[PDB]
C-alpha cells in the first residue's frame, strides 16, 4: 500500500498481541534496534517513521498537514487500519507520545496502553510549569539550524543523545539527523519544541505508562511528575537511572528491561 511504503511500515514477529513503535524527532525506526528482539517471539511488532524522517520522501511532506501534531496521528490511524489492527499496545517515543496521545483520543478504541518514553507535553516554561526551555532558548536552536545545519547536527546530537560524546548511538543520531531535509527539520523542530499538549491530559482515558531518563536535557523529571499528575487515566512513572533523550538506543541494558517491564505487565 502506499501509505505502508510512504511509512516505510515493518511487521516482524508474531503473538495474539501487537505493538506499535513510534519514534521522534531526528531519528526513525531503527531508534527501536535494541528493543525489538525482546518484542518478536511474544508480539506482532509494527514499526513505521514518521513523515519528514530522513527515511522518507519529501515530496510526501506536507506542511499544512503537519504543523500540528494530530497530522501524525492521523497517519498512525491511518496505519492501523490500513494493517486491519483492531487493538494494540503503542510505544511513544519523545513526540510520538503526544502523537500516540492525541491519536488515541480520536480513536480510544484502538490503543490497550501507552508507554511513553522521553515524553513532554510542553517544553517552554509557563506560570508555575518548567518544561526545561525559554523561548530564547528554542530561538537560538532554531538560527543555528538555518544558519549551518551540519554544525548544528554535530553540536546538537551529543547533547541530545547524553553518555560519552563519540559513542556510536550519538554517531547514529547525529547521522539520522543530519539526513533530515533542513527546511523539514526547521519546521517539524518548531511544530514540536512550541507544542502544548497540558490541555487535553485530563481527557486521555488510556492507561499511560510514563518512563523518562532521570537525566535528560529536553525533559525534566518535573514533567513525568506534570504527566502523571494531569493524565486523566490511570497512569505510572518510572524514572530510568539513564542519561540521554533516545535512552533506548544509546543504553539499553538499564532501558530495555524497564521498557518491556511496562509493556509486558498493566497497572
Ligand atoms: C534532546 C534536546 C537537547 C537540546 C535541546 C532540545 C532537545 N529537544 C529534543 O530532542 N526534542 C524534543 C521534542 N522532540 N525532540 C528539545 C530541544
Not at 526551555?133 to 548544528?152: G, T, V
Not at 511528575?225 to 533516545?246: K, M, Q, R, T, W
Request: net charge negative.
Amino acid at each position: 500500500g502506499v501509505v505502508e511504503e510512504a511509512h516505510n511500515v515493518k511487521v516482524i514477529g508474531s503473538g495474539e498481541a501487537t505493538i506499535v513503535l513510534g519514534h521522534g524527532f531526528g531519528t526513525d525506526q531503527s531508534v527501536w534496534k535494541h528493543l525489538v528482539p525482546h518484542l518478536v517471539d511474544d508480539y506482532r511488532v509494527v514499526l513505521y517513521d514518521n513523515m519528514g524522517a530522513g527515511t522518507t520522501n519529501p515530496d510526501y511532506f506536507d506542511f499544512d498537514r503537519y504543523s500540528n501534531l494530530e497530522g501524525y496521528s492521523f497517519d498512525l490511524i491511518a496505519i492501523l487500519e490500513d494493517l486491519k489492527i483492531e487493538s494494540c499496545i503503542f510505544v511513544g517515543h519523545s513526540v510520538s507520545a503526544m502523537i500516540g496521545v492525541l491519536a488515541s483520543l480520536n480513536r480510544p478504541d484502538l490503543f490497550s496502553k501507552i508507554v511513553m518514553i522521553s515524553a513532554s507535553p510542553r517544553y517552554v516554561n509557563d506560570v508555575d510549569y518548567q518544561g526545561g526551555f525559554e523561548q530564547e532558548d528554542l530561538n537560538q536552536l532554531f538560527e543555528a539550524i538555518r544558519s549551518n545545519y551540519k554544525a548544528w547536527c554535530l553540536g546538537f546530537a551529543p547533547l541530545a543523545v547524553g553518555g560519552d560524546m563519540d559513542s556510536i548511538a550519538v554517531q547514529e543520531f547525529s547521522r539520522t539527523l543530519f539526513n533530515m531535509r533542513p527546511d523539514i527539520a526547521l519546521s517539524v523542530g518548531q511544530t514540536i519544541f512550541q507544542s502544548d499538549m497540558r490541555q487535553i491530559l485530563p481527557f486521555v482515558t488510556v492507561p499511560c505508562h510514563i518512563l523518562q531518563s532521570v537525566k535528560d536535557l529536553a525533559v525534566p523529571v518535573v514533567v513525568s511528575e506534570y504527566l502523571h499528575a494531569n493524565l486523566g487515566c490511570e497512569s505510572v512513572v518510572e524514572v530510568i537511572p539513564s542519561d540521554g533523550h533516545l535512552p533506548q538506543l544509546s543504553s539499553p541494558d538499564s532501558v530495555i528491561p524497564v521498557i518491556l517491564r511496562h509493556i509486558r505487565n498493566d497497572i
